[PDB]
Write an enzyme that holds these catalytic residues in place. Structure first.
Site, short mmCIF file in Angstrom:
data_model
loop_
_atom_site.label_atom_id
_atom_site.label_comp_id
_atom_site.label_asym_id
_atom_site.label_seq_id
_atom_site.Cartn_x
_atom_site.Cartn_y
_atom_site.Cartn_z
N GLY B 119 -18.74 -71.78 -51.10
CA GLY B 119 -17.30 -71.56 -51.10
C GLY B 119 -16.88 -70.11 -51.05
O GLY B 119 -15.77 -69.79 -51.48
N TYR B 130 -33.98 -72.81 -51.79
CA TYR B 130 -34.01 -72.01 -50.57
C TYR B 130 -35.36 -71.35 -50.34
O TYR B 130 -35.45 -70.42 -49.52
CB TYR B 130 -32.90 -70.95 -50.61
CG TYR B 130 -31.50 -71.50 -50.79
CD1 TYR B 130 -31.20 -72.83 -50.50
CD2 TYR B 130 -30.47 -70.69 -51.27
CE1 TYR B 130 -29.92 -73.33 -50.67
CE2 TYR B 130 -29.19 -71.18 -51.44
CZ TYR B 130 -28.92 -72.50 -51.14
OH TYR B 130 -27.65 -72.99 -51.32
N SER B 200 -22.57 -75.24 -45.68
CA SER B 200 -21.32 -75.14 -46.43
C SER B 200 -20.60 -73.86 -45.99
O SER B 200 -20.36 -73.70 -44.79
CB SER B 200 -21.62 -75.26 -47.92
OG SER B 200 -20.43 -75.24 -48.68
N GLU B 331 -19.46 -86.34 -48.13
CA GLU B 331 -19.16 -84.93 -48.34
C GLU B 331 -18.22 -84.71 -49.53
O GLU B 331 -18.47 -83.84 -50.37
CB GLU B 331 -18.55 -84.33 -47.08
CG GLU B 331 -19.49 -84.30 -45.88
CD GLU B 331 -20.41 -83.09 -45.89
OE1 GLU B 331 -20.34 -82.29 -46.85
OE2 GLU B 331 -21.21 -82.95 -44.95
N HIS B 444 -22.63 -83.36 -51.13
CA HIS B 444 -22.63 -82.13 -50.36
C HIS B 444 -23.77 -81.22 -50.78
O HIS B 444 -23.91 -80.88 -51.96
CB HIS B 444 -21.29 -81.42 -50.55
CG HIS B 444 -21.09 -80.23 -49.66
ND1 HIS B 444 -20.81 -80.34 -48.32
CD2 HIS B 444 -21.10 -78.91 -49.94
CE1 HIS B 444 -20.67 -79.14 -47.80
NE2 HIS B 444 -20.84 -78.25 -48.77
C1 LIG Z 1 -13.38 -76.81 -64.96
C2 LIG Z 1 -12.83 -75.73 -64.35
C3 LIG Z 1 -13.52 -75.12 -63.15
N1 LIG Z 1 -12.60 -74.45 -62.30
C4 LIG Z 1 -12.56 -73.06 -62.59
C5 LIG Z 1 -11.30 -75.00 -62.44
C6 LIG Z 1 -13.05 -74.65 -60.97
C7 LIG Z 1 -14.22 -74.05 -60.53
C8 LIG Z 1 -14.66 -74.26 -59.24
C9 LIG Z 1 -13.94 -75.08 -58.39
C10 LIG Z 1 -14.42 -75.32 -56.97
C11 LIG Z 1 -15.73 -76.08 -56.93
C12 LIG Z 1 -16.11 -76.40 -55.51
O1 LIG Z 1 -15.23 -76.54 -54.68
C13 LIG Z 1 -17.56 -76.56 -55.12
C14 LIG Z 1 -17.98 -75.47 -54.15
C15 LIG Z 1 -19.45 -75.52 -53.78
C16 LIG Z 1 -19.84 -75.93 -52.51
C17 LIG Z 1 -21.18 -75.97 -52.17
C18 LIG Z 1 -22.14 -75.59 -53.10
N2 LIG Z 1 -23.52 -75.63 -52.75
C19 LIG Z 1 -24.07 -74.34 -52.97
C20 LIG Z 1 -23.67 -76.01 -51.40
C21 LIG Z 1 -24.17 -76.58 -53.58
C22 LIG Z 1 -23.46 -77.92 -53.51
C23 LIG Z 1 -23.87 -78.94 -54.29
C24 LIG Z 1 -21.76 -75.18 -54.37
C25 LIG Z 1 -20.41 -75.14 -54.70
C26 LIG Z 1 -12.77 -75.69 -58.83
C27 LIG Z 1 -12.33 -75.48 -60.12
#
Ligand SMILES: C=CC[N+](C)(C)c1ccc(CCC(=O)CCc2ccc([N+](C)(C)CC=C)cc2)cc1
Ligand SMILES: C=CC[N+](C)(C)c1ccc(CCC(=O)CCc2ccc([N+](C)(C)CC=C)cc2)cc1
Lengths: 540, 540
Positions: B119, B130, B200, B331, B444
């Site tokens: 992200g 990795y 991603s 996804e 995902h």
């Molecule tokens: C509780 C509060 C948290 N608060 C701060 C609100 C909070 C924190 C973070 C988010 C967004 C989380 C995502 O959108 C996942 C993004 C993501 C995508 C891919 C990956 N890989 C690396 C590919 C691994 C996937 C498995 C990791 C993360 C919303 C709210």
């Protein structure tokens, strides 16, 4: 001679006729007057009951067909000519027919009342497919059918005037229903179990009577075949009704030379014009080119229809009411050869992508460009967006869902959730004698021959399985007329027919195979037409 | 004195380390500095190439991870902790890693450059999933991975200023790509056959290097796993970028209440704040509560991206290019536990109808109520409109298609129809070691462990057929890196993987069973997000 053919009704006496069927004789009384002939100064006016006559009225043959347009699209073609008038056209046409078994029933018998359709511009009770000698002989029931004024003679409305109040064609049907209450007992009929059933514009008319208090007390059950009063074609506003009646008058020369704009003088001119002069300009008052749209339809006048049919269904109480609704497999395919681009009954109608985009403008008239885009997405297979055979079948579903199927599914869903016991079906059999091409599938209006037991006629070339299928459909329709339930009740081997519930949405498929219960009257498609599309045009 | 573990590059000398695999040994060089440490005055600025060093840089262990938010949603949980930093955070993080076979290839070998996702706010090349020791040993390729600045340190943008131009995290990747051109030959690599694959937000960066002319001359093939440059989360305009940057400043005490509004003195303050202070307020700049939306992401500035990514795809010529795109089966399931109402990792997440209607406003942020209604109309099963299990999978598909699956289908369709050779896959296997609940399906990012041959690790408890499945995907990925075509070059017995085209829309499914070709990458669902929804927002 026979004495069963002489009957005395409140008007006078009638002489009937004994008709032969393969399974027995039937007593028929064809051409019974129920209203004074609405000609001259009575044109466009509500009907008045027939004056009592001295002597004996000869009720041994069908009377005249109400004045109407005659289809000339495919002359001499069985598919279209079978719906055209088979008697002389005349404003003198308010006559009704009664079929009763032989010998006459000793005990009171349920009454079925058939209201033909035809887009409110055509139709007659004299048609051979509407013959009820087989239904009466096989199920021993009393069948009644009537003629109502069609087109401008029955639905031209200048709202707010005493000379052209509109909905007089529906008032013809109500007067014929009052005649049943007062006179069906003379034929062995029970006036306490009348069952109204119509098709296309007739099925819509049956729905109009459910929403009108004066007509509600004249029947007890309803069957709607491929039609509903909430359809986009079934009604029109008072503003548009005034414009369509004014343009028709201007087309025939009324008012003469820029005369005063009183509605009294406008209708005065239309009463002097020959009947055919009005019919020759019926289609010239339509706002734009479209299919499944008609010039003169019932109008929301506030008298017959207090509010729009969509509103009256939402606020209506329907306890103690049994309803049988249904549709054929391919409703909209029949209307495509009547103006949709690229369609012909003599080829395969493998339309192109551009023709499909234009067919939506004709199939769904008076909608915004964005509203048309939503219709295109919902009916386009995006894996094969240019397949001609898929686009042809898709445009049939667009007209079929928008006009017939989805307005019916919303009616049945609202009826069941407001006290009514609703049964739903889907007709899936294609008659072996169907003159229409193969891609038409199961077109509009071609379940009527099986309901009326026409395959039982020896001169017709139906097959043996179709004859048995005809008796089974008559049993369903008759069982619903007697007990309010299409089942035997006890067979007990036939699969039961579950009522249509607003949650489960159960219906059956009617063909040569036994009853198969299904779920969802095209729920995914109709959710677009009933839920999302209104909000699409409402939010400009 | 092992000659294989000592390499001289343009900058200086490096000592590598020999790693163990069940098959054989691999020579790894972990921690090569390819850029000057961007600390203090170099914060927010584009990277500078690493100064040449006198001595021997130790390249035997992963270096520090770029400063980033650390997920604390489910502490001590293998599913979330496997993506958290395993090295200490520091702004001194611009290092890359090179895996090369042992013995070093005597002939030029294709290079696989890996870009992690997260992200644009998290991620690191040090992660155990990795590890490219199995991919290099089994297929004899050269894997390279780098660290690019994430979060505000790599994507905070004040457009119009030379102190914070934005997209600096993307330039860290380009600089690492230029390092490959000049130095990969020392490890046995071929700078003429460089394949660039990410996942991603990393796959979004790969697609953005395709649309940047300077980055175009540093690679020859591209793979995008569950990511696209045109996704609604991948870019942010200049106007919103100034808002989020200035709002982030106000939270950390800058400007010093109250100095002038010029950006020069504003970035001067942001360079003084400790890195953690910038990370603590990263999520406080999001305008609306939403899932799959991130604070600091690439900006369309005109220097790196001439226009919006969607506009650049429509106009670019992609002849002589081979692209591998694909998505996992489910996804949106991973992002639902990050704010969507009613969703929890520790229960069935059987949401109600009201929770579904609220989750759509979180999964699809900043859309009109009419636009939200159109989303509810598509993804609702109107035969079972309140089924909690069906509503759960529905909301998982809304987030999956809107953010990942449909933006990928738009890229693959426009790449193939404009000269590029495209192959598409759909990963459908759920690992037996998956700690996430069952209702998430194949979430995902959980194809990455199979592409990297992690099942071949003896310390992990992957099944026997999963080990073989891992060697298949490595062969698919390596053959694409060498030949430009995934299916085996000389094996008519293995099923063929057909290229994806705009008209045919042909992809394959990757699981334990052999290749099974399918048609349409969510064609019916993606037609709404790509074709109709833009028009619904144009007329508001
Ligand atoms: C509780 C509060 C948290 N608060 C701060 C609100 C909070 C924190 C973070 C988010 C967004 C989380 C995502 O959108 C996942 C993004 C993501 C995508 C891919 C990956 N890989 C690396 C590919 C691994 C996937 C498995 C990791 C993360 C919303 C709210
Ligand atoms: C070619 C030009 C002719 N012009 C004037 C343009 C023309 C004339 C008529 C129409 C509309 C035709 C219909 O909408 C069929 C309406 C209909 C509904 C039901 C029935 N049943 C009686 C039920 C039988 C059904 C089979 C018959 C017809 C369009 C254009």
């Amino acid at each position: 001679e026979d004495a069963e053919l002489l009957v005395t009704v409140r008007g006078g006496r009638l002489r009937g006729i004994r008709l032969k069927t393969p399974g027995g004789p039937v007593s028929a009384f064809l051409g019974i007057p129920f209203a004074e002939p609405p000609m001259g100064p009575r044109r466009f006016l509500p009907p008045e009951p027939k004056q009592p006559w001295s002597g004996v009225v000869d009720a041994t043959t069908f009377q005249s067909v109400c004045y109407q347009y005659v289809d000339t699209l495919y002359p001499g073609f069985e598919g279209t000519e079978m719906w055209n008038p088979n008697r002389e056209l005349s404003e003198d046409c308010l006559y009704l027919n009664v079929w009763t078994p032989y010998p006459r029933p000793t005990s009171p018998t349920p009454v079925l009342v058939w209201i033909y359709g035809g887009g409110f511009y055509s139709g007659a009770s004299s048609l051979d497919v509407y013959d009820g000698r087989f239904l009466v002989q096989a199920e021993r029931t009393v069948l009644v059918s009537m003629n109502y004024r069609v087109g401008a003679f029955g639905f031209l409305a200048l709202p707010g005037s005493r000379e052209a109040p509109g909905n007089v064609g529906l008032l013809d049907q109500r007067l014929a229903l009052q005649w049943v209450q007062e006179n069906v007992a003379a034929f062995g009929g029970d006036p306490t179990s009348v069952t109204l059933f119509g098709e296309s514009a007739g099925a819509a008319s049956v729905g109009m009577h459910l929403l009108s208090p004066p007509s509600r007390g004249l029947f007890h059950r309803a069957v709607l075949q491929s039609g509903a009063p909430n359809g986009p074609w079934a009604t029109v506003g008072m503003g548009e009704a005034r414009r369509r009646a004014t343009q028709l008058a201007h087309l025939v020369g009324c008012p003469p030379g820029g005369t005063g704009g009183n509605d009294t003088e406008l209708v005065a001119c239309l009463r002097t014009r020959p009947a055919q002069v009005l019919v020759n300009h019926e289609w010239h008052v339509l706002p734009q080119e479209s299919v499944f749209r008609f010039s003169f339809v019932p109008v929301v006048d506030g008298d017959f229809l207090s509010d729009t049919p969509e509103a009256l269904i939402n606020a209506g109480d329907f306890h103690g009411l049994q309803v049988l609704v249904g549709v054929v497999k391919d409703e909209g395919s029949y209307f495509l050869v009547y103006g949709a681009p690229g369609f012909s009954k003599d080829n395969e109608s493998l339309i192109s992508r551009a023709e499909f985009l234009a067919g939506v403008r004709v199939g769904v008239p008076q909608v915004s460009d964005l509203a048309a885009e939503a219709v295109v997405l919902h009916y386009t297979d995006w894996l094969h967006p240019e397949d001609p055979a898929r686009l042809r079948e898709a445009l049939s579903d667009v007209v079929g869902d928008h006009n017939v199927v989805c307005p019916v599914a919303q009616l049945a869903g609202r009826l069941a959730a407001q006290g009514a016991r609703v049964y739903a079906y889907v007709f899936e059999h294609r008659a072996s004698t169907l003159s229409w091409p193969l891609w038409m599938g199961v077109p509009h209006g071609y379940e009527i021959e099986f309901i009326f037991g026409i395959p039982l006629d020896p001169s017709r070339n139906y097959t043996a399985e179709e004859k048995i299928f005809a008796q089974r459909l008559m049993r369903y329709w008759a069982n619903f007329a007697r007990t309010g339930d299409p089942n035997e009740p006890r067979d007990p081997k036939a699969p039961q027919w579950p009522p249509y519930t607003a949650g489960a949405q159960q219906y059956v498929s009617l063909d040569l195979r036994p009853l198969e219960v299904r779920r969802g009257l095209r729920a995914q498609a109709c959710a677009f037409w009933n839920r999302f599309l209104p909000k699409l045009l409402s939010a400009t």
